[PDB]
């Protein structure tokens, strides 16, 4: 068994998602199509949100698993405003290494730019210390 440790650090270059505002940005993490979803806090009225939030997701397969990262803009009614997403194959991360990297998000229809998000990702055997080289 292996575990995927993910620090959702920050994002930048976000589009304007509110006609009289900026972006009320939060991120969502999903392994494969698992119903166990992880969400950051919202950072209100910014194009450069910093969350620095850690999540720990059990992996079912260290090669075929995929991490989908959704970026969204929180709005005032019952729904939010999708911005962009990226699908990150898990096989590209060397086992036990802590990889700090920026990822260009692909914007949804009707959004001019998708932004970039910084993630620290670390696949490690269960019980090993998160975010330390193994
Ligand atoms: Ca909006
Ligand atoms: Ca908003």
Which residue segments constitute the domains of the chain, with CATH numbers given?
2-125 (2.60.40.150)
Q: Give the C-alpha separation, 83 to 24, whole Å.
A: 11
Give the number of whichever ligand sits closest to the CA of residue 110. Answer: 1
Q: Give the C-alpha separation, 9 to 52, whole Å.
A: 4
Q: In the PDB record, what is the listed experimental method?
A: X-ray
Nearest to 1 by CA among 56, 61, 66: 61
Q: How far is the CA of 102 from the centre of ligand 2 (A)?
A: 23
Calculate ∠ Cα 93-87-37, nearest 5°: 95
Strands across the sheet with 98-104, in order? 50-59, 2-12, 116-125, 98-104
Q: How far is the CA of 18 from the centre of ligand 1 (A)?
A: 4
Pairing verdict, β 25-31 and 38-39: antiparallel
Pairing verdict, β 81-89 and 106-107: antiparallel
Q: How far is the CA of 79 from the centre of ligand 2 (A)?
A: 10
Backbone angles phi, psi at 6, to 5 degrees: -135, 120
């Amino acid at each position: 068994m292996y575990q995927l440790h993910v620090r959702v650090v920050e994002a930048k270059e976000l589009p304007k998602m509110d006609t009289f505002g900026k972006c009320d940005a939060f991120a969502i993490l999903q392994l494969n199509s698992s119903r166990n979803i992880h969400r950051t806090k919202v950072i209100e009225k910014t194009y450069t949100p910093v969350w620095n939030e850690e999540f720990h997701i059990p992996l079912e397969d260290v090669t075929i698993d995929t991490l989908t990262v959704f970026l969204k803009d929180e709005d005032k009614g019952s729904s939010d405003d999708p911005i962009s997403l990226i699908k990150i194959p898990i096989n590209q991360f060397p086992l036990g290494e802590v990889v700090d990297k920026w990822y260009s998000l692909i914007p949804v229809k009707g959004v001019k730019k998708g932004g970039q998000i910084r993630l620290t990702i670390h696949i490690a055997p269960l019980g090993a210390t998160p975010f330390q080289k193994t």
